[PDB]
Design an enzyme around this catalytic site. Structure first.
Site, PDB file in Angstrom:
ATOM      1  N   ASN A  52     -11.139  -6.427  -7.932  1.00  0.00           N
ATOM      2  CA  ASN A  52      -9.951  -6.443  -8.808  1.00  0.00           C
ATOM      3  C   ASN A  52     -10.268  -5.905 -10.206  1.00  0.00           C
ATOM      4  O   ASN A  52      -9.374  -5.330 -10.841  1.00  0.00           O
ATOM      5  CB  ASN A  52      -9.402  -7.859  -8.890  1.00  0.00           C
TER       6      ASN A  52
ATOM      7  N   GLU B 280     -12.949   8.886  14.292  1.00  0.00           N
ATOM      8  CA  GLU B 280     -13.780   9.891  13.591  1.00  0.00           C
ATOM      9  C   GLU B 280     -14.535   9.292  12.399  1.00  0.00           C
ATOM     10  O   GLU B 280     -15.640   9.768  12.082  1.00  0.00           O
ATOM     11  CB  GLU B 280     -12.881  10.998  13.059  1.00  0.00           C
TER      12      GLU B 280
ATOM     13  N   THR C  58     -12.889 -16.300  -9.711  1.00  0.00           N
ATOM     14  CA  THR C  58     -11.761 -17.225  -9.471  1.00  0.00           C
ATOM     15  C   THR C  58     -12.263 -18.603  -9.028  1.00  0.00           C
ATOM     16  O   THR C  58     -11.587 -19.592  -9.323  1.00  0.00           O
ATOM     17  CB  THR C  58     -10.824 -16.615  -8.426  1.00  0.00           C
TER      18      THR C  58
ATOM     19  N   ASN D 232      -1.673  -4.338  -5.253  1.00  0.00           N
ATOM     20  CA  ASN D 232      -1.273  -4.301  -3.835  1.00  0.00           C
ATOM     21  C   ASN D 232      -0.532  -3.001  -3.517  1.00  0.00           C
ATOM     22  O   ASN D 232      -0.699  -2.471  -2.407  1.00  0.00           O
ATOM     23  CB  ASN D 232      -0.419  -5.518  -3.521  1.00  0.00           C
TER      24      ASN D 232
ATOM     25  N   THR E 293     -10.672 -19.704   3.953  1.00  0.00           N
ATOM     26  CA  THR E 293     -10.031 -19.313   5.232  1.00  0.00           C
ATOM     27  C   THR E 293     -10.206 -17.815   5.493  1.00  0.00           C
ATOM     28  O   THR E 293     -10.493 -17.441   6.639  1.00  0.00           O
ATOM     29  CB  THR E 293      -8.560 -19.733   5.260  1.00  0.00           C
TER      30      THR E 293
ATOM     31  N   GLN F  66      -4.244 -15.350   1.651  1.00  0.00           N
ATOM     32  CA  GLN F  66      -3.298 -15.085   0.550  1.00  0.00           C
ATOM     33  C   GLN F  66      -3.305 -13.628   0.123  1.00  0.00           C
ATOM     34  O   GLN F  66      -2.231 -13.014   0.075  1.00  0.00           O
ATOM     35  CB  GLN F  66      -3.648 -15.992  -0.628  1.00  0.00           C
TER      36      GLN F  66
ATOM     37  N   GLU G 254      -2.417 -22.470   4.750  1.00  0.00           N
ATOM     38  CA  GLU G 254      -1.376 -23.179   3.979  1.00  0.00           C
ATOM     39  C   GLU G 254      -0.014 -22.575   4.310  1.00  0.00           C
ATOM     40  O   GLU G 254       0.087 -21.356   4.545  1.00  0.00           O
ATOM     41  CB  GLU G 254      -1.628 -23.092   2.478  1.00  0.00           C
TER      42      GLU G 254
HETATM   43  N1  LIG Z   1      -6.156  -7.651  -5.280  1.00  0.00           N
HETATM   44  C1  LIG Z   1      -5.764  -8.897  -4.970  1.00  0.00           C
HETATM   45  N2  LIG Z   1      -6.653  -9.912  -5.014  1.00  0.00           N
HETATM   46  C2  LIG Z   1      -6.200 -11.149  -4.687  1.00  0.00           C
HETATM   47  C3  LIG Z   1      -4.913 -11.408  -4.332  1.00  0.00           C
HETATM   48  N3  LIG Z   1      -4.759 -12.753  -4.071  1.00  0.00           N
HETATM   49  C4  LIG Z   1      -5.949 -13.296  -4.251  1.00  0.00           C
HETATM   50  N4  LIG Z   1      -6.879 -12.359  -4.635  1.00  0.00           N
HETATM   51  C5  LIG Z   1      -8.290 -12.579  -4.951  1.00  0.00           C
HETATM   52  O1  LIG Z   1      -8.988 -13.059  -3.822  1.00  0.00           O
HETATM   53  C6  LIG Z   1      -9.788 -14.205  -4.187  1.00  0.00           C
HETATM   54  C7  LIG Z   1      -9.147 -15.463  -3.682  1.00  0.00           C
HETATM   55  O2  LIG Z   1      -9.085 -15.414  -2.260  1.00  0.00           O
HETATM   56  P1  LIG Z   1      -7.845 -16.111  -1.518  1.00  0.00           P
HETATM   57  O3  LIG Z   1      -7.111 -15.094  -0.706  1.00  0.00           O
HETATM   58  O4  LIG Z   1      -6.976 -16.841  -2.492  1.00  0.00           O
HETATM   59  O5  LIG Z   1      -8.562 -17.140  -0.517  1.00  0.00           O
HETATM   60  P2  LIG Z   1      -7.808 -17.698   0.780  1.00  0.00           P
HETATM   61  O6  LIG Z   1      -7.826 -16.647   1.835  1.00  0.00           O
HETATM   62  O7  LIG Z   1      -6.441 -18.161   0.387  1.00  0.00           O
HETATM   63  O8  LIG Z   1      -8.737 -18.938   1.208  1.00  0.00           O
HETATM   64  P3  LIG Z   1      -8.290 -20.471   0.943  1.00  0.00           P
HETATM   65  O9  LIG Z   1      -8.264 -20.682  -0.540  1.00  0.00           O
HETATM   66  O10 LIG Z   1      -9.277 -21.399   1.590  1.00  0.00           O
HETATM   67  O11 LIG Z   1      -6.918 -20.652   1.534  1.00  0.00           O
HETATM   68  C8  LIG Z   1      -9.865 -14.168  -5.705  1.00  0.00           C
HETATM   69  O12 LIG Z   1     -10.917 -13.323  -6.130  1.00  0.00           O
HETATM   70  C9  LIG Z   1      -8.513 -13.578  -6.078  1.00  0.00           C
HETATM   71  O13 LIG Z   1      -8.613 -12.907  -7.309  1.00  0.00           O
HETATM   72  C10 LIG Z   1      -3.979 -10.356  -4.289  1.00  0.00           C
HETATM   73  O14 LIG Z   1      -2.812 -10.511  -3.973  1.00  0.00           O
HETATM   74  N5  LIG Z   1      -4.454  -9.086  -4.621  1.00  0.00           N
HETATM   75  N1  LIG Z   2      -9.668  29.053  12.548  1.00  0.00           N
HETATM   76  C1  LIG Z   2      -9.331  27.774  12.786  1.00  0.00           C
HETATM   77  N2  LIG Z   2     -10.275  26.821  12.726  1.00  0.00           N
HETATM   78  C2  LIG Z   2      -9.875  25.549  12.970  1.00  0.00           C
HETATM   79  C3  LIG Z   2      -8.567  25.212  13.273  1.00  0.00           C
HETATM   80  N3  LIG Z   2      -8.498  23.838  13.459  1.00  0.00           N
HETATM   81  C4  LIG Z   2      -9.731  23.385  13.282  1.00  0.00           C
HETATM   82  N4  LIG Z   2     -10.622  24.385  12.986  1.00  0.00           N
HETATM   83  C5  LIG Z   2     -12.053  24.219  12.721  1.00  0.00           C
HETATM   84  O1  LIG Z   2     -12.712  23.693  13.855  1.00  0.00           O
HETATM   85  C6  LIG Z   2     -13.630  22.652  13.448  1.00  0.00           C
HETATM   86  C7  LIG Z   2     -13.098  21.319  13.881  1.00  0.00           C
HETATM   87  O2  LIG Z   2     -13.128  21.267  15.311  1.00  0.00           O
HETATM   88  P1  LIG Z   2     -11.949  20.531  16.107  1.00  0.00           P
HETATM   89  O3  LIG Z   2     -10.993  21.533  16.668  1.00  0.00           O
HETATM   90  O4  LIG Z   2     -11.295  19.493  15.255  1.00  0.00           O
HETATM   91  O5  LIG Z   2     -12.750  19.816  17.293  1.00  0.00           O
HETATM   92  P2  LIG Z   2     -12.077  18.736  18.280  1.00  0.00           P
HETATM   93  O6  LIG Z   2     -11.917  17.449  17.524  1.00  0.00           O
HETATM   94  O7  LIG Z   2     -12.989  18.572  19.459  1.00  0.00           O
HETATM   95  O8  LIG Z   2     -10.749  19.280  18.709  1.00  0.00           O
HETATM   96  C8  LIG Z   2     -13.718  22.774  11.934  1.00  0.00           C
HETATM   97  O9  LIG Z   2     -14.700  23.718  11.546  1.00  0.00           O
HETATM   98  C9  LIG Z   2     -12.323  23.260  11.573  1.00  0.00           C
HETATM   99  O10 LIG Z   2     -12.352  23.937  10.337  1.00  0.00           O
HETATM  100  C10 LIG Z   2      -7.557  26.235  13.324  1.00  0.00           C
HETATM  101  O11 LIG Z   2      -6.360  26.082  13.579  1.00  0.00           O
HETATM  102  N5  LIG Z   2      -8.024  27.518  13.070  1.00  0.00           N
HETATM  103 MG   LIG Z   3      -5.414 -19.960   0.260  1.00  0.00          MG
END
Ligand SMILES: Nc1nc2c(ncn2[C@@H]2O[C@H](COP(=O)(O)OP(=O)(O)OP(=O)(O)O)[C@@H](O)[C@H]2O)c(=O)[nH]1
Ligand SMILES: Nc1nc2c(ncn2[C@@H]2O[C@H](COP(=O)(O)OP(=O)(O)O)[C@@H](O)[C@H]2O)c(=O)[nH]1
Ligand SMILES: [Mg+2]
Ligand SMILES: Nc1nc2c(ncn2[C@@H]2O[C@H](COP(=O)(O)OP(=O)(O)O)[C@@H](O)[C@H]2O)c(=O)[nH]1
Lengths: 49, 49, 269, 430, 442, 52, 430
Positions: E205, E253, E178, E227, E144, E10, E70
């Site tokens: 929540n 990463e 809940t 949400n 579930t 849900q 459900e």
């Molecule tokens: N943030 C958030 N929490 C939710 C939401 N819906 C339910 N919850 C929370 O999640 C818990 C309930 O879990 P559910 O998702 O209803 O359980 P389920 O997956 O349906 O499992 P079953 O009841 O067996 O079908 C409670 O703590 C609710 O407060 C939502 O839309 N947003």
């Molecule tokens: N001077 C400079 N440094 C860079 C640039 N892009 C990333 N860096 C630096 O290089 C490091 C990240 O390495 P990165 O290039 O992401 O490694 P890779 O994931 O293997 O490609 C960090 O210290 C960044 O700040 C750039 O365009 N210019």
């Molecule tokens: Mg349910």
């Protein structure tokens, strides 16, 4: 004495090791396109016929 | 004069093993063999009497 | 459009080696692998609208008379009865070359040009000076308005010398350029005064060899005198060389006389 | 005389992208690959970094390797990305996980043969091959593992050439990765046997350079990678332009390394001027020399005042007198004589090149060999011993297959390097 | 590139509704699964591929399964707004619930339903080319969620092997409750979770209710708010795979940097700019302020105080307009604090990540709009206090075998209670031993 | 979605002065005329067997 | 100097249709048979593959044989099908069933006389006959059995000519037919005695060529058969066009075969490169030589790195210098000397022809005799031994009538071929 059809081309300022601003941060959408694992041709530009 | 070569490429996958790690003093060193050179000594020694 | 002697222009520079629109002339053409020969009859060859504008333009007679008297004034006063040096100094104030690849004439430059003829002058009284200013301004205005202008209100130097010096064939230009290319050991646009001194031919000139009226070394020094920048750095640009030979070609009529004196003038290899 | 570049990992690929932007700008190469430059001096040595493709185009002598293509997709999407040859990009299907053993043993042995095929094609294509140049971080996973694996294989294939590395090393104040001491120690152990010359950079030093010297309000990694690309392109400048006193990578190595294990150097680049003060200081050889020796302008955390210079090198670009260079190097050696090792009569080599970088009247790059580098290795060894005694994260490396004996060898070799530096610092004539 | 989401019971399905709503709104997929046709951007982006696959006619479909015993909640998803988005095979529903019995989920009913779930997950894993982990959402308080979540993670761990499995787990709150039998189900679930999970994130929540009362201005919160906060956290952790950035962080990463010993894999989670629109206009929200925010215990989503323990590793993820120099200055200032202590065997305590895409805003949401945010997951010895309290509750009831006959009737040996309770006692001793300084032991 | 931002507008008034050339100026050179003294061709040596 | 082609079985007829399309295109013959070419160089050697029909037409000297007409009806319905002489199609009424014994003994002996009658009419029609050329698969049923039967009959009737075969052989990873080891073993036993030169191709190797080198998104059998037809038309190019250093099939055999049993070769074609990559790499003689040696461009699964080259041949097409060719072949022999048999001073023969294929500036076809082919025969012998010990599917062959001794001799002969290759690989001068 008038300019012909082709246009002037403009060249940008030189890249001094300092004095650069964060122009990469002016974008507002950073979606990345997958090219290496999917496209066989990659993004190679070929002009129109 | 020497122009380009083609190259076949080695297989080195089987060489790397976790049990055979690098140690101190076994790096690759390139030392040419010594070559003897004959030197003439026609210079007469100083004789100011 | 790609025949020999066709002049065309395409557009603004697409690399950093140029700074403005330039004209190109075809010197060679090969069609050993051409199978579709296309051509439009009764049409101009290439893209040479400036040449067509020059051909269709007409200048006034009073302008031609003014330039005639101005040329006479330079030939006498600025020279010493030698027409080549007189014509050479006539384009002194228009030496600078623009990004287009051609030299331009401004109205103030024209006013300074006409004043240098040493012909429009009188006693230093106030009224006489005012009258001379009015006369030179009227002459300069008359000359300025008889030629087509570009943006920024300037006229062309080549079209000016078409009516000062006259028409010149392509062979004369080719020979002058060949001499300049031979004399220039670097690939800049400047000649050294020492090379000019070494390569000139005062020795075999008949006025110094068979008549003994002039001395060879003195006439060599007098020849080194006429260059404008011989006493300071000793560099002679392309434009000054072409001005001197513009005067030379204006002086002579026949082709074979021109070519013979041109070959005898310089003792190059 | 040609250089082949290798870019490994995220840091290496990004620095490489900025380096090739700087080099393409200096030689006037359009991002389409067409030459649009304005002097023959640019064309006559273009072969050093570019190969010529048909009808005008130039392609960069570069190999890009990474275990996941994300960074490569970013560089291909960049403004100059099109210049790179598609076949040069080598990639696997899962990341290094910042783990040295994974990057060296599992995906390394899987990809390495394709990297050797590409590197041997680029190497043999050259008229006369000069040394290789590698950019990578030592603290990462694919950078450390694949960089040291490829360096070992290239040293087996081409033992007579030069091996040069640019390397990023962990800052002393804040870590970017938790397991940095293991990866750093094992990588330094690999480098001291395989490498010919290694430069080390701390990101903390570049941050302090940007904030104090350049006073940038909002710096980005593009600025740090531009400073690095500037010095990297500067060290090779005498290889590819005329000058009054030519120099070469082998000449720097011959003058800088007194003994074969002592090949770790400090780096600096001088003409950094503040965003609002250029009106307060004229360009001159003394100004460049003063910034050249200021520790504020050095890209490592260690300070020269706790050590002594064995050797140093300065490469000057610009139209200048040789008298001013020689007398400046004499005056600095004479006035600060206590900081120079006394059993060597002259520690500084100078070189002069006629063509400066665009938009600067003059520039110099400085390389320094100083014993204060021993302080960094001692700190890394301390952190390694703290983690190893408690098996803090060792199960990842041992589960991949590493023998614990490898860790003790790397620790012993680094401790002996620190001891050797300390012994040469306190040596005397007697 | 790809990641597969498994939603159980849900809480897991209801949190899934918020997660998929967010991922759709962030990428731009319409509820029917088609990208808008009015846009003429010209470019054909693929970033969605991490979470969606295309058929070829341009419809998008998501890489998820919904598992429940459900029918009601899954039928509500089938009849809801995203009805056309999901493929009907992905929505799996049984006939009757596990009735708060872990034994009923694990032995009797989940053992029957598990093979359909494994076949659907296999069908997803066959349509991938760079799978890099499983994300699992479940609560250990219910029958579930505990029983089938453990059994399915065990089977996944044998079948897929080295591939990483990251769990988002709702543990029983310290005073909000809940069901009466929550301690038994949580202990028996946790016994399986020690061996078969790479990193487990714990949520309570009561903490999210406190955070929504104090920071947001909500007097009467309900599960949809919690949400949406969880969905924001998952979006922050997975943003590193989908958008450009300075320092990317792959899912592999986390296990390398946060887990020192194979049993010590439970981490605390917190999120910084939880703020209301009216407060947002009275305050600037710089990098250093939100970095200072992530370390206050009022920001945590689990009811534990990290001041009662020592940190072993921290992972800080920054998204939005942030510059590395500010992150470095902030982390050095945090390191200066006297109420933050690290174990002496962990000198390099930090991992950093920096991504350029700012957090998305949901039309009916309660968070303000902000240009930057930071999220942290960290490993600390304070976590031993949560298990100790679940233990006393288990011990007090088990002293009289208060409800065991249900579990024994549904298929479990009485011995399994004592085994699990002794394993959690050993985990408590592990947290005492790992935290002892080396200088004291010479 | 929201449009991107660019910063190419309102530059400095003297942007066109800044150069984009690697070598903006050619090398400076000068020349001197020669002073023809008798030493210009007197004092030269002649071949070892020059006969009148 | 005329070649006669034989196309047998489904694979042979399908490859043959594409081959005759490629040859008709190169000589400018319209599908009606009319000459529409644009250079005299095309007409002056048209006799080599075509006979002249009345009022302009040309007909190709090829025999098509198959046991069920389905493939022949498909090729006759194709765009070039009309060119073929109607009397040259020979077919039966029931299939080979992928069984060697049926194709060799029952329907083979029934049809073979009509095929021999047509082949004799074609041979005796030539003014001077060069060798026969046959295309077929070894894994099939009528291709292997009836092809080897016809090979034996033509070797009895024309023992002084050349016998050349192009053959398709089973992939090491996936079978296209369950009973492939029996048909392959019996066919190789027949070929090693009867054949003069045999070329081997793996369909899996062509898949790897297309995917790695050419990066085609949706390849089809037309592409694989085009690559094969390109190489086949390339080997004969010097026979039918002028050149600076002429070559011939007999001269190739004399230079390639050191001993009569060692006549199995690997094949390759060089200027293969993807449409995305072509802008990044110019064509040049060192580039043809680099692709020529690379195992990625070889049409067999065995890799040269596990064996040694006894001999190799390269045929170049185009107007080009001999200094580039002789130097590149000396350089590749000297650099990689461990992969070349040391008791032969020069292993590579070169040949140069002036006319390249249309649309390519240059091309080369490579033929290689390498000992690594022994591993393929060993794999087939292993699978044969696994099936024979359990009498796998043997009742089909025994019910047709075969004696088991044929199976034991063919296995023994292949094992002896593997042993002899292994002995020459490890031979030494002493
Ligand atoms: N943030 C958030 N929490 C939710 C939401 N819906 C339910 N919850 C929370 O999640 C818990 C309930 O879990 P559910 O998702 O209803 O359980 P389920 O997956 O349906 O499992 P079953 O009841 O067996 O079908 C409670 O703590 C609710 O407060 C939502 O839309 N947003
Ligand atoms: N001077 C400079 N440094 C860079 C640039 N892009 C990333 N860096 C630096 O290089 C490091 C990240 O390495 P990165 O290039 O992401 O490694 P890779 O994931 O293997 O490609 C960090 O210290 C960044 O700040 C750039 O365009 N210019
Ligand atoms: Mg349910
Ligand atoms: N390269 C290639 N292989 C083919 C072609 N047609 C069939 N084959 C292969 O040849 C084998 C089947 O032999 P086949 O020609 O059917 O034998 P037949 O029944 O005696 O004619 C299998 O390995 C097929 O993959 C084709 O057009 N090209």
């Amino acid at each position: 004495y008038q300019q012909s059809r082709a246009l002037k081309k403009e060249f940008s300022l030189p890249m001094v090791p300092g004095m650069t601003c964060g122009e990469e941060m002016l974008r507002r959408s950073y979606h990345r396109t997958q090219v290496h694992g999917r496209k066989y041709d990659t993004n190679t530009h070929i002009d129109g016929v | 004069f020497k122009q380009r070569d083609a190259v076949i490429g080695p297989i080195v996958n089987d060489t790397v093993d976790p049990k055979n790690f690098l140690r101190t003093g076994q790096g690759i060193k390139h030392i040419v063999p010594p070559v003897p050179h004959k030197k003439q000594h026609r210079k007469d020694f100083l004789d100011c009497g | 459009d790609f025949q020999i002697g066709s002049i065309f222009t395409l557009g603004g520079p697409l690399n950093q080696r140029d700074d403005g629109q330039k004209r190109y002339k075809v010197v060679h053409c090969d069609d050993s692998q051409l199978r579709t020969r296309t051509g439009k009859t009764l049409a101009f060859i290439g893209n040479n609208v400036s040449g067509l504008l020059q051909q269709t333009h007409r200048v006034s007679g009073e302008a031609i008379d003014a330039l005639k008297r101005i040329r006479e004034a330079y030939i006498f006063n600025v020279g010493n009865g030698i027409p080549e040096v007189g014509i050479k100094a006539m384009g002194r104030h228009f030496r600078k070359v623009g990004s287009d690849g051609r030299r331009w004439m401004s109205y103030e430059g024209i006013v300074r040009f006409v004043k240098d003829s040493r012909n429009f002058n009188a006693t230093l009284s106030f009224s006489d000076t005012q009258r001379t200013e009015e006369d030179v301004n009227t002459v300069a205005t008359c000359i300025y308005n008889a030629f087509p202008k570009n943006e920024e209100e300037c006229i062309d130097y080549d079209f000016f010398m078409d009516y000062v010096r006259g028409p010149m064939s392509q062979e004369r230009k080719d020979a002058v350029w060949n001499i300049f290319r031979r004399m220039d050991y670097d690939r800049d646009g400047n000649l050294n005064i020492i090379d000019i001194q070494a390569c000139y031919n005062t020795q075999d000139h008949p006025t110094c060899s068979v008549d003994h009226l002039f001395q060879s070394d003195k006439m060599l020094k007098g020849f080194l005198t006429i260059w404008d920048e011989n006493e300071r750095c000793g560099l002679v640009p392309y434009a000054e060389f072409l001005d001197y030979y513009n005067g030379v070609s204006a002086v002579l009529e026949d082709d074979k006389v021109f070519f013979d004196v041109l070959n005898n003038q310089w003792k190059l290899l | 005389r040609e250089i082949v570049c290798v870019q490994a990992g995220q840091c290496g690929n990004q620095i490489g992208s900025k380096f090739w932007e700087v080099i393409s700008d200096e030689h006037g190469v359009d991002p389409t690959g067409t030459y649009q430059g304005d002097s023959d001096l640019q064309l006559e040595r273009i072969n050093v970094y570019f190969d010529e493709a048909t009808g005008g185009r130039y392609v960069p002598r570069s190999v890009l390797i990474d275990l996941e293509p994300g960074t490569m997709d970013s560089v291909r999407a960049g403004p100059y990305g099109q210049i790179f040859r598609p076949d040069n990009f080598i990639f696997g299907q899962s990341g290094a996980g910042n783990n040295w053993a994974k990057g060296h043993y599992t995906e390394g042995a899987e990809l390495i043969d394709s990297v050797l095929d590409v590197c041997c094609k680029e190497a043999e294509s050259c008229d006369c091959l000069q040394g290789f140049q590698i950019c990578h971080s030592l603290g990462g996973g694919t950078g450390s593992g694949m960089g040291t694996l490829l360096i070992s294989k290239l040293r087996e294939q081409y033992p007579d050439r030069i091996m040069m590395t640019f390397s990023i090393i962990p800052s002393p104040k804040v870590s970017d990765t938790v397991v940095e001491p293991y990866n750093t120690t094992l990588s330094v152990h690999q480098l001291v046997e395989n490498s010919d010359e290694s430069m080390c950079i701390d990101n903390e030093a570049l941050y302090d350079i940007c904030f104090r010297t350049l006073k940038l309000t909002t710096p980005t990694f593009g600025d740090l990678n531009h400073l690095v690309s500037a010095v990297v392109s500067g060290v090779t400048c005498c290889l590819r332009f005329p000058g009054q006193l030519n120099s070469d990578l082998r000449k720097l190595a011959v003058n800088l390394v007194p003994f074969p294990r002592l090949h770790f150097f400090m780096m600096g680049f001088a003409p950094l001027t503040s965003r609002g003060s250029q009106q307060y200081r004229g360009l001159s050889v003394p100004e460049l020399t003063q910034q050249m020796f200021d520790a504020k302008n050095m890209m490592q955390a260690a300070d020269p005042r706790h050590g002594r210079y064995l050797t140093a090198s300065a490469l000057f670009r610009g139209r200048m007198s040789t008298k001013e260079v020689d007398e400046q190097m004499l005056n600095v050696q004479n006035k600060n004589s206590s900081y120079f090792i006394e059993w060597i009569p002259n520690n500084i080599k100078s070189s002069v090149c006629d063509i400066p970088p665009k938009g600067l009247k003059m520039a110099v790059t400085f390389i320094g060999n100083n014993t204060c580098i021993q302080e960094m290795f001692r700190r890394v060894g301390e952190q390694f011993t703290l983690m190893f005694r408690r098996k803090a994260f060792l199960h990842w490396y041992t589960g991949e297959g590493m023998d614990e004996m490898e860790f003790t060898e790397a620790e012993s070799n680094m401790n002996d390097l620190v001891s050797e530096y300390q012994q040469y610092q306190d040596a005397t004539i007697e | 590139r790809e990641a597969i989401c498994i939603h159980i019971g849900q809480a897991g399905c209801q949190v899934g509704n918020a997660c998929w709503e967010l991922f759709c709104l962030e990428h731009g997929i319409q509820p029917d699964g088609a990208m808008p046709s009015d846009k003429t951007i010209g470019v054909e982006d693929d970033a969605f591929n991490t979470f969606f696959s295309e058929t070829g006619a341009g419809k998008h479909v998501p890489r998820a399964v919904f598992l429940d015993l459900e029918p009601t909640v899954v039928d509500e998803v089938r009849t809801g707004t995203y009805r056309q988005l999901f493929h009907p095979e992905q929505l799996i529903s049984g006939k009757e619930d596990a009735a708060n019995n872990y034994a009923r989920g694990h032995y009797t009913i989940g053992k029957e339903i598990v093979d359909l779930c494994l076949d659907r997950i296999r069908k997803l894993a066959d349509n991938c080319t760079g799978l890099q982990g499983f994300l699992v959402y479940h609560a250990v308080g219910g029958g579930t969620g505990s029983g089938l979540g453990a059994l399915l993670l065990e089977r996944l761990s044998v079948d897929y092997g080295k591939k990483s499995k990251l769990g988002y787990t709702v543990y029983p709150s310290p005073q909000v409750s809940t069901a009466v039998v929550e301690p038994y189900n949580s202990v028996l679930s946790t016994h399986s979770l020690l061996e078969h999970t790479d990193v487990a994130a714990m949520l309570d929540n009561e903490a999210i209710y406190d955070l929504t009362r104090r920071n947001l201005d909500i007097e009467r919160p309900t599960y949809t708010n919690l949400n949406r906060l969880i969905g924001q956290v998952v979006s922050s952790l997975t943003a590193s795979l989908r958008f450009d950035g300075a320092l990317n962080v792959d899912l592999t990463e986390f296990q390398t940097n946060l887990v020192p010993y194979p049993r010590i894999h439970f981490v605390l989670t917190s999120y910084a700019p939880v703020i209301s629109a009216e407060k947002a206009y009275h305050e600037q929200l710089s990098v250093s302020e939100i970095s200072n925010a992530v370390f206050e215990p009022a920001s945590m989503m689990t009811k534990c105080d990290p001041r009662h323990g020592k940190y072993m590793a921290c992972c800080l993820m920054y998204r939005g307009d942030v510059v590395p120099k500010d992150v470095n200055a902030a982390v050095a200032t945090i390191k200066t604090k006297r109420t933050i202590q690290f174990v002496d065997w962990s000198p390099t305590g930090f991992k950093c990540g920096i991504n350029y895409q700012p957090p998305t805003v949901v039309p009916g949401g309660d968070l303000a709009k902000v240009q930057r945010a930071v999220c942290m997951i960290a490993n600390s010895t304070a976590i031993a206090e949560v298990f100790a309290r679940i233990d006393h509750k288990f011990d007090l009831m088990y002293s009289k075998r208060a409800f065991v006959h249900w579990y024994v009737g549904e298929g479990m040996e009485e011995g399994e209670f004592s085994e699990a309770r002794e394993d959690l006692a050993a985990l408590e001793k592990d947290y005492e031993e790992v935290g002892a300084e080396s200088a004291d032991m010479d | 979605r929201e449009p991107d931002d660019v910063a190419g507008k309102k530059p400095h008034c003297f942007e066109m002065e800044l150069n984009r050339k690697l070598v903006p100026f050619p090398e400076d050179k000068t020349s001197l005329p020669r002073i023809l003294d008798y030493s210009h061709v007197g004092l030269h040596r002649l071949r070892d067997g020059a006969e009148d």
